[PDB]
C-alpha cells in the first residue's frame, strides 16, 4: 500500500498510488506544529484531486490537533513565475499572517514549486520545516528528493539558492491523471537516467513497460486504473537510485548528470519551448555517443538506449520528427560553437546500468565537437597501432542460420 525509500538514514520518502489518507495522517501526527501552510499552483488548486487532500487536511486536524491552523497560498503557474519577486510574495504572506519558526510548509506543486517554496523554507525564520508533495512525474524523481532549492535570476537559471532537506517527500501517484501527456512523457526521461546509470534489471522491465504505457497516455484521458502497480514501480527505482547516491555524499552525485552536460546546453538555447526531459533525452544519446567514441561503451548499448527513448516518444536527436515541430523556428539557434563553450566533464557510460569507474571524467572539446555534428574532419595518420585486432559487425548470414538450427536441435 506504501513503499518507503530511505534518505540520509531516515525512511521519509513515501511512495504509493492514492495515498491521500496517509498524507494527512502522517504530517500532523509525527511533525507537530501550530501553523500549517499549503502553497500550491492555481491550476492545481482547481483540480478535484487537490480538494481530496486539503479537505482531508481540514477535517482531520479537528480530530488530532484542534488548536492548529491552516493557511493556503496560490501562486500563478508558469516558468517565469519562479523568481525573486514571487518568492517575496510568500516571503511577505507568511510574515503578515503571523507565522514563526514553527511552520510546516507543504509545497504541493511541481518542480517550480519545490524549487521555490523549499528556498523560502531555507530562508524563512532562518530555516523551517518543509514537506514536499510533488505532483508531476519529473519532480517525483528529480527535484523533490535531494533538497536542492533555487530560483531564477534573469542572468542565470537555478543559481541562487540554498541546501535544505525536506522532512517528508510523498510520491502521490494518483495526482497523475490530471497531467498532460507532453508533461508526463517528459518525466520518463529521468526514469531512464536512473535506470541506466545504476540499475539494469529495471531497464529490462521498462522495455516491457514501454508498450502499454504509451497506449494509455497518448489516449487523451489517461485511464490509469489496472496499471497502478507498474506505474508505482516505475518511480520506485528512480528514487532508490537517487537516494542511494545522495546518501553517499561532489563525489558520486555527479553521476546523476548523465546527459546534463549536453542537455543543459541544448536547454540553454531552446529554453522556453522545449522542456527539461526533452533535451536531457538528446543529451543521453549524445553522451552515450561520446563514451562509444572513446572505446568504453559497446555499440549494442546505444542501439538499446536509443530504442527505449524513442519508444517513449522522447527525442533522440535535435532534428527528430516531433522535436522539430515543437521547437520550430528556434531550431536554427543550435550552433556547434555556442553549445560547446557553455558545456567539460561527462558521465561516460560503461554499459547499460553501470558507470565508468563510478566517477566523472574530463573529456576534450574535440570529441565533444565531433559527436554533435554530421561532419568529419580526418587528420593525417601519424601513429596507427602495429598490433591491432578489428572485429566488424558479426556475419548476419551464419547468425540467422545458427538460431534456426539451434532452435530445432
Amino acid at each position: 500500500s506504501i513503499e518507503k525509500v530511505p534518505i540520509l538514514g531516515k525512511e521519509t520518502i513515501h511512495v504509493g498510488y492514492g495515498i491521500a489518507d496517509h498524507i494527512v495522517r502522517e504530517v500532523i501526527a509525527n511533525l507537530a506544529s501550530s501553523t500549517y501552510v499549503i502553497v500550491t499552483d492555481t491550476n492545481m488548486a482547481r483540480t478535484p484531486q487537490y480538494s481530496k487532500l486539503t479537505d482531508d487536511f481540514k477535517t482531520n486536524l479537528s480530530e488530532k490537533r484542534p488548536e492548529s491552523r491552516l493557511l493556503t497560498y496560490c501562486v500563478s503557474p508558469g516558468e517565469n513565475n519562479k523568481n525573486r519577486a514571487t518568492k517575496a510574495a510568500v516571503e511577505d504572506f507568511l510574515l503578515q499572517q503571523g507565522c514563526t519558526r514553527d511552520t510546516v510548509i507543504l509545497a504541493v506543486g511541481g518542480g517550480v514549486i519545490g524549487d521555490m517554496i523549499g528556498f523560502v523554507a531555507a530562508t524563512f525564520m532562518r530555516g523551517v520545516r518543509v514537506v514536499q508533495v510533488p505532483t508531476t512525474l519529473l519532480a517525483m524523481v528529480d527535484s523533490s528528493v535531494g533538497g536542492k532549492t533555487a530560483i531564477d535570476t534573469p542572468l542565470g537559471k537555478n543559481f541562487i539558492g540554498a541546501f535544505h532537506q525536506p522532512e517528508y517527500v510523498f510520491c502521490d501517484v494518483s495526482f497523475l491523471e490530471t497531467l498532460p501527456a507532453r508533461q508526463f512523457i517528459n518525466g520518463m526521461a529521468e526514469v531512464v537516467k536512473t535506470a541506466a546509470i545504476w540499475n539494469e534489471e529495471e531497464f529490462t522491465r521498462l522495455e516491457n513497460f514501454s508498450k502499454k504505457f504509451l497506449s494509455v497516455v497518448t489516449s487523451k484521458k489517461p485511464d490509469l486504473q489496472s496499471i497502478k502497480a507498474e506505474l508505482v514501480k516505475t518511480v520506485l527505482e528512480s528514487v532508490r537510485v537517487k537516494a542511494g547516491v545522495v546518501s553517499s555524499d561532489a563525489g558520486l552525485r555527479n553521476l546523476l548528470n548523465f546527459g546534463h552536460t549536453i542537455g543543459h546546453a541544448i536547454e540553454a538555447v531552446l529554453t522556453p519551448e522545449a522542456l527539461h526531459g526533452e533535451c536531457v533525452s538528446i543529451g543521453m544519446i549524445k553522451e552515450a555517443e561520446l563514451s562509444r567514441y572513446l572505446g568504453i561503451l559497446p555499440p549494442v548499448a546505444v542501439a538499446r538506449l536509443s530504442k527505449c527513448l524513442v519508444a517513449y516518444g522522447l527525442p533522440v536527436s535535435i532534428d527528430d520528427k516531433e522535436f522539430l515541430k515543437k521547437v520550430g523556428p528556434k531550431r536554427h539557434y543550435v550552433e556547434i560553437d555556442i553549445l560547446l563553450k557553455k558545456m567539460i566533464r561527462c558521465v561516460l557510460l560503461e554499459k547499460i546500468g553501470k558507470c565508468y569507474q563510478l566517477k566523472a571524467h574530463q573529456v576534450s572539446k574535440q570529441d565533444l565537437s565531433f559527436v554533435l555534428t554530421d561532419e568529419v574532419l580526418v587528420h593525417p595518420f601519424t601513429n596507427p597501432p602495429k598490433e591491432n585486432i578489428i572485429v566488424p559487425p558479426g556475419s548476419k548470414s551464419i547468425s540467422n542460420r545458427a538460431l534456426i538450427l539451434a532452435a530445432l536441435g
Partner: protein, 141 residues
C-alpha cells in the same frame, strides 16, 4: 594491371582508394561493376570527381574505372578550397575515402559523416580509440 570482380562488387570503393595511391606506369583498370549504379546512385562517376579533388586522375571506362596513382600523398585541395568530399548519404563512399583522407598535410573534411549507419554505424568510433587517429567536426553557418 587489371582485376575483375563479379562476386566481389561490394569491395570496389575500397579497392579504388588503395589503387589511388599505388603508383606506376600501368594503371589500375578495374571492370565488371555495372550493378553499382542501381544501389543508390552512379558511384562510378563519384570516384571521377572526388579523386580529381585529391589530384589523382581517374577516367571512366565503359564497364569500370581506370585509376592512376601519383604518390602515396596527393594534391592539396582542402576545405579552404571549393568544397569537401560529398558522400551522397551512402556508407560506402564515406568509409572508403576516410582511408585516403589521412595522407595529406592538412585534414581532409568529409561531408555527411553519420550516413554510415546502414552497415557500420560506429566506423568513425573505431578510427579514434582503436586506430589512434584524431577526428574533428565542422559546422558551416
Amino acid at each position: 594491371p587489371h582485376v575483375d570482380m563479379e562476386p566481389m562488387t561490394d569491395a570496389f570503393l575500397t579497392a579504388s582508394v588503395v589503387a589511388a595511391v599505388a603508383k606506376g606506369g600501368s594503371s589500375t583498370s578495374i571492370t565488371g561493376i555495372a550493378n553499382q549504379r542501381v544501389k543508390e546512385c552512379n558511384r562510378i562517376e563519384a570516384m571521377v570527381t572526388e579523386l580529381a579533388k585529391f589530384g589523382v586522375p581517374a577516367n571512366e571506362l565503359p564497364d569500370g574505372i581506370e585509376i592512376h596513382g601519383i604518390d602515396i600523398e596527393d594534391l592539396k585541395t582542402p576545405e579552404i578550397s571549393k568544397r569537401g568530399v560529398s558522400s551522397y548519404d551512402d556508407h560506402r563512399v564515406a568509409m572508403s575515402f576516410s582511408l585516403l583522407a589521412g595522407l595529406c598535410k592538412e585534414p581532409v573534411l568529409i561531408l555527411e559523416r553519420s550516413t554510415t549507419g546502414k552497415t557500420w554505424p560506429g566506423w568513425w568510433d573505431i578510427l579514434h580509440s582503436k586506430f589512434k587517429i584524431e577526428l574533428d567536426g565542422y559546422e558551416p553557418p
